Amino acid sequence: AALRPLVKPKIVKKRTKKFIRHQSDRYVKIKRNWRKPRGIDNRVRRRFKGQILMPNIGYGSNKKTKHMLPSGFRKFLVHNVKELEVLLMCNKSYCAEIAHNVSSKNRKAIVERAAQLAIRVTNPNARL
RNA sequence: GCGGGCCCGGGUGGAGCCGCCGCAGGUGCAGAUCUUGGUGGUAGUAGCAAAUAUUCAAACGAGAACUUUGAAGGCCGAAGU
Ligand SMILES: [Mg+2]
Ligand SMILES: [Mg+2]
Ligand SMILES: [Mg+2]
Ligand SMILES: [Mg+2]
């Protein structure tokens, strides 16, 4: 019985797999982070058949559901209760995110204040 | 998040750290027979073959083919090992 968002449309994604760098599987020194190929003779660079896809502007997500969580909210990093009170007038569209560096002593106070103000927390029972 | 990357959960860690508005740079690596350091397959592999040769018993010793003692068989054969 969580706080439902104002609008929960169907989120559609053009692609969900990560874009992996070319030859990142063959070598350990080559990481999964994408790098634009620029070789003169590169199958991926000139889009050969059955090769690794390159990121394009076409894969852009719909602006209505962009940055939207599966619940229907948007993340907002919160470091203290004063920053939590900012989301008072955006509770139905945005949810508070508690920073990892916040100690457990203040995390419970932030969670209690969010419950009082009716703001969803994506990590309410995080550290205890 | 198209992406460069980023935000949380868990574990280790024990003392500093980050966001924003601007400023500045010794600021982003897959190659350069690049420099330094480390680690693999090869691989328990090549190899431990130049100059005739060792054997028996005892002692010390936890442990003896290689140490010592005694016996036997050999070599260097006075421009000699
Ligand atoms: Mg390198
Ligand atoms: Mg060409
Ligand atoms: Mg052998
Ligand atoms: Mg002779």
Curated annotation (Swiss-Prot):
Compartments where found: Cytoplasm
Modified residues (N6-succinyllysine): 49
Leader sequence segment: none
GO cellular component: cytosolic large ribosomal subunit
Key words, A-Z: Cytoplasm, Isopeptide bond, Phosphoprotein, Ribonucleoprotein, Ribosomal protein, Ubl conjugation
Residues recorded with modification Phosphoserine: 61
Chain positions of cross-link Glycyl lysine isopeptide (Lys-Gly) (interchain with G-Cter in SUMO2): 8
Listed GO MF terms: structural constituent of ribosome
Main location: cytoplasm
CDD domains per record: Ribosomal_L32_L32e (cd00513)
Organism superkingdom: Eukaryota
Family statement drawn from the similarity comment of this UniProt entry: Belongs to the eukaryotic ribosomal protein eL32 family.
Protein name per UniProt: Large ribosomal subunit protein eL32
Organism for this UniProt entry: Oryctolagus cuniculus (Rabbit)
Phylogenetic placement of the source organism: Eukaryota, Metazoa, Chordata, Craniata, Vertebrata
